[PDB]
Design an enzyme around this catalytic site. Structure first.
Site, PDB file in Angstrom:
ATOM      1  N   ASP A 148       0.837  -1.195   0.000  1.00 57.39           N
ATOM      2  CA  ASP A 148       0.000   0.000   0.000  1.00 57.39           C
ATOM      3  C   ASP A 148       0.889   1.269   0.000  1.00 57.39           C
ATOM      4  OD1 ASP A 148      -3.058   0.995   1.049  1.00 57.39           O
ATOM      5  OD2 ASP A 148      -1.361   2.285   1.716  1.00 57.39           O
ATOM      6  N   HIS A 149       2.046   1.202   0.700  1.00 52.02           N
ATOM      7  CA  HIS A 149       2.975   2.336   0.762  1.00 52.02           C
ATOM      8  C   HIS A 149       3.843   2.492  -0.502  1.00 52.02           C
ATOM      9  CE1 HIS A 149       2.527   2.499   5.413  1.00 52.02           C
ATOM     10  NE2 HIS A 149       1.355   2.551   4.792  1.00 52.02           N
ATOM     11  N   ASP A 150       3.724   1.574  -1.444  1.00 47.42           N
ATOM     12  CA  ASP A 150       4.313   1.716  -2.766  1.00 47.42           C
ATOM     13  C   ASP A 150       3.254   2.398  -3.709  1.00 47.42           C
ATOM     14  OD1 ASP A 150       5.699   1.359  -5.180  1.00 47.42           O
ATOM     15  OD2 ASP A 150       6.110  -0.788  -4.791  1.00 47.42           O
TER      16      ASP A 150
END
Ligand SMILES: *[C@@H]1O[C@H](CO[C@@H]2O[C@@H](C)[C@@H](O)[C@@H](O)[C@@H]2O)[C@@H](O[C@@H]2O[C@H](CO)[C@@H](O[C@@H]3O[C@H](CO[C@H]4O[C@H](CO)[C@@H](O)[C@H](O)[C@@H]4O)[C@@H](O)[C@H](O[C@H]4O[C@H](CO)[C@@H](O)[C@H](O)[C@@H]4O)[C@@H]3O)[C@H](O)[C@H]2NC(C)=O)[C@H](O)[C@H]1NC(C)=O
Ligand code: HEC
Ligand SMILES: Nc1cc([C@H](CCN[C@]23CC[C@](c4ccccc4)(CC2)CC3)c2ccccc2)c2nn[nH]c2n1
Ligand SMILES: *[C@@H]1O[C@H](CO)[C@@H](O)[C@H](O)[C@H]1NC(C)=O
Ligand SMILES: *[C@@H]1O[C@H](CO)[C@@H](O)[C@H](O)[C@H]1NC(C)=O
Ligand SMILES: [Ca+2]
Ligand SMILES: [Cl-]
Ligand SMILES: [Cl-]
Lengths: 103, 465
Positions: free
Chosen positions: A94-96
């Site tokens: 999700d943080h990519d």
């Protein structure tokens, strides 16, 4: 926008040569359905006291959490087919993909 | 207009109001703080308000390398021509690299332990210190980049720093793509939704829009239902690492000091592999460590993550449950009986109707996580559609997708097919016994565990120039 390249740019610019900001950082999200706001264009549902959504009062997000989400911690069911690494890779992934800034 | 300390509803604040008889917040004049997401067109009376994605939507390991050029340069070691990412100069984890520290003016990590004086870590994405399990994954990929750049330098001694950095960065991004699409997504969607939304890759299609859709930022928060209320740390025998083997999650947010001073990333990675995820059940949706005590240590009041998800979908103007069901081609229940049939649960249907009045108004996260899970998946039909549709656009609309012709040679693609998350753990940590593939399913020691020598390694021979 170069005609020949070998590596990605850091911002994601030029990945799509026809519309070079698609997928690039610091750009508006695409929408799959039109937005639904109290005034049609900016105020969120729940902003104005007494303003209904589609004929019904807006439930407080904390009331929905209290009445539907809340459960006794000791009742937790361990997943026999998933490791906690399944949860952690999801957050890392999700943080990519997305970070929505706030003021 | 300080959203942090005030309860006044004035732009850009949209604080969450407190209901009567709340189990934790007795003062109804108090609130759970909330800042509206930055608008793409500030001050406009013409545009329909939309929000911004600060990151590259591509699965390109931007959480390691950064999504903006000054940050990307700052993350690199530019003291030499080795193509390395910068590492912590003050501390090491049993001789292995740690992420460098950031230099924030307002550092929340420092608050979690005054005497430790351990600041936030600096990584490609700003949330790297949010929980130590997440920090451990970032640290693992930082080490993997440097391990690849080091191996590529001995294979190709004439390659300069830029070439080494770019070639190792390309491999890291491909590994994230492979682990995600081969191992992770089939276990999220289940087999039938995997075939429907992610059929066999053909080639890059320049007409596939790769942007993240606004709804995905809320739908992909299904993962909040998998969160356990503790961080588990295990020793080299996969036994509880005393004296604090199960730290409450409300004491690990921003606790970078725990990575540095409480044993590094090995006990954390072991705890992730050998502890089950929480199962999402209709009467066990999300734990109070995130529902009552989110960031409790560093805020004036503990936050409620599920409530924040719902207020965020409202802030973003997301349509309700039935609109998304219709978008997906799924039936839209209008009555409590019909909602009961969708959920195989009339009691939950009645609770949802008591809150919302109509399934048309159920917030997307709430409705999505209430659906019974697909067979061998961990989302119901609605979240499987939104998630599956997003990941197909990220794959088919990515010119640098690892299988796209021209990105890697055929030989490099064949070598990349052998990578796995357990192998990355073997190569970059002191752990020698890891989960067997699939790491996302394997969760019980010693039943699901194998030694590192049984796993295939990445052969870089086809990278020699
Ligand atoms: C490259 O990808 C393109 C995008 O593909 C989409 O995304 C990928 C990831 C997959 O999920 C894929 O399944 C998706 O379609 C792809 O181009 C797309 O191709 C389809 C099929 O030709 C196009 O659909 C047609 O659209 C027209 C126009 O109306 C559309 O848009 C309006 C406005 O949003 C909507 O209201 C409509 O409902 C449609 O969505 C329709 O008129 C047409 O339907 C009619 O014609 C067909 C016969 O052709 C009949 O069977 C129907 O019953 C109707 O009479 C189609 O629905 C789509 O618009 C187009 N998208 C883009 C961005 O161009 C492309 O084909 C891919 N190429 C390769 C080689 O893979
Ligand atoms: C599998 C997915 C997934 C997992 C697991 C996950 N999150 Fe979420 N989380 C998201 C996504 C996606 C968002 C939206 C990110 C964005 O665009 O800003 C989000 C947003 C948030 C937000 C912003 C809330 C707001 O104001 O709208 C917080 C806080 C958060 N998550 C905390 C956590 C913490 C803490 C953990 C675990 C230690 C966690 N999340 C694990 C996917 C996940
Ligand atoms: N969109 C998001 C946002 C966040 C948080 C938001 C946290 N906001 C605070 C938490 C503590 C605070 C502070 C600072 C100094 C002293 C005392 C408090 C004040 C508010 C700094 C930032 C985050 C965003 C960025 C970096 C890490 C975490 C997420 N965490 N996981 N997933 C997430 N997705
Ligand atoms: C850069 O690399 C050299 C050689 O590996 C190392 O000694 C130095 O600490 C690195 N600098 C940073 C900031 O990581
Ligand atoms: C702070 O860190 C030290 C380790 O340096 C530890 O002994 C101490 O107990 C920690 N305090 C808290 C409140 O966690
Ligand atoms: Ca990215
Ligand atoms: Cl959307
Ligand atoms: Cl440092």
């Amino acid at each position: 926008c170069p005609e020949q390249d070998k590596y990605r740019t850091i911002t994601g610019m030029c990945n799509n040569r026809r519309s070079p900001t698609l997928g690039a950082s610091n750009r508006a999200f695409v929408r799959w359905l039109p937005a639904e706001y109290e005034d049609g264009f900016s105020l969120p549902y729940g902003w104005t006291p007494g303003v209904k959504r589609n004929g019904f009062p807006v439930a407080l997000a904390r009331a929905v959490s209290n009445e539907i989400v809340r459960f006794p911690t000791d009742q937790l069911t361990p997943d026999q087919e998933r490791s906690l690494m399944f949860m952690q890779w999801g957050q890392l992934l999700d943080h990519d993909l997305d970070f929505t800034p706030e003021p | 207009v300080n959203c942090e300390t005030s309860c006044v509803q004035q732009p850009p604040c949209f604080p969450l109001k407190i209901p009567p008889n709340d189990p934790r917040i007795k003062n109804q004049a108090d609130c759970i703080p909330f800042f509206r997401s930055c608008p793409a067109c500030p001050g406009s009376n013409i545009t329909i308000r939309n929000q911004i994605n600060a990151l590259t939507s591509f699965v390109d390991a931007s959480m390691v390398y950064g999504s903006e050029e000054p940050l990307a340069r700052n993350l690199r070691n530019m003291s030499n021509q080795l193509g390395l990412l910068a590492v912590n100069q003050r501390f090491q984890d049993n001789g292995r690299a740690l992420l460098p520290f950031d230099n924030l003016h307002d550092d929340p990590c420092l608050l979690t332990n005054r005497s430790a004086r351990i600041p936030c870590f600096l990584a490609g994405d700003t949330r790297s210190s949010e929980m130590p399990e997440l920090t451990s994954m970032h640290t693992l990929l930082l080490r993997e980049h440097n391990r690849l750049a080091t191996e590529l330098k001995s294979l190709n001694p004439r390659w300069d720093g830029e070439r080494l950095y770019q070639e190792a960065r390309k491999i890291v991004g491909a590994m994230v793509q492979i682990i995600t699409y081969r191992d992770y997504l089939p276990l999220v969607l289940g087999p039938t939704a995997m075939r429907k939304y992610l059929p066999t890759y053909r080639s890059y299609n320049d007409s596939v829009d790769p942007r993240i859709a606004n709804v995905f930022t809320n739908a992909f928060r299904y993962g909040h239902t998998l969160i356990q209320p503790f961080m588990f740390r295990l020793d080299n025998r996969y036994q509880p690492m005393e004296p604090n083997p199960r730290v409450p999650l409300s004491r690990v947010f921003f606790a970078s000091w725990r990575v540095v001073l409480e044993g590094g990333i090995d006990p954390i990675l072991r705890g992730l592999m050998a502890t089950p995820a929480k199962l999402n059940r209709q009467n066990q949706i999300a734990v109070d460590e995130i529902r009552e005590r989110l960031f409790e240590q560093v805020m004036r009041i503990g936050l409620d993550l599920p409530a924040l998800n719902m207020q965020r979908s409202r802030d973003h103007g997301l349509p309700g449950y039935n609109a998304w069901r219709r978008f997906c081609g799924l039936p839209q229940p209008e009555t409590v009986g019909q909602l009961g049939t969708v959920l195989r649960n009339l009691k939950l249907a009645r609770k949802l109707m008591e809150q919302y009045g109509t399934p048309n108004n159920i917030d997307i996260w709430m409705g999505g996580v209430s659906e019974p899970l697909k067979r061998k998946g961990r989302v119901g039909p609605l979240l499987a559609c939104i998630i599956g549709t997003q990941f197909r656009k990220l794959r088919d609309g990515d010119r640098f997708w690892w299988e796209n012709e021209g990105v890697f040679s055929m030989q490099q693609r064949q070598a990349l097919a052998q990578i796995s998350l357990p192998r990355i753990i073997c190569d970059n940590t002191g752990i020698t016994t890891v989960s067997k593939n699939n790491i996302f399913m394997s969760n019980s020691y010693p039943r699901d565990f194998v030694n590192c020598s049984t796993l295939p390694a990445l052969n870089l021979a086809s990278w020699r120039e």
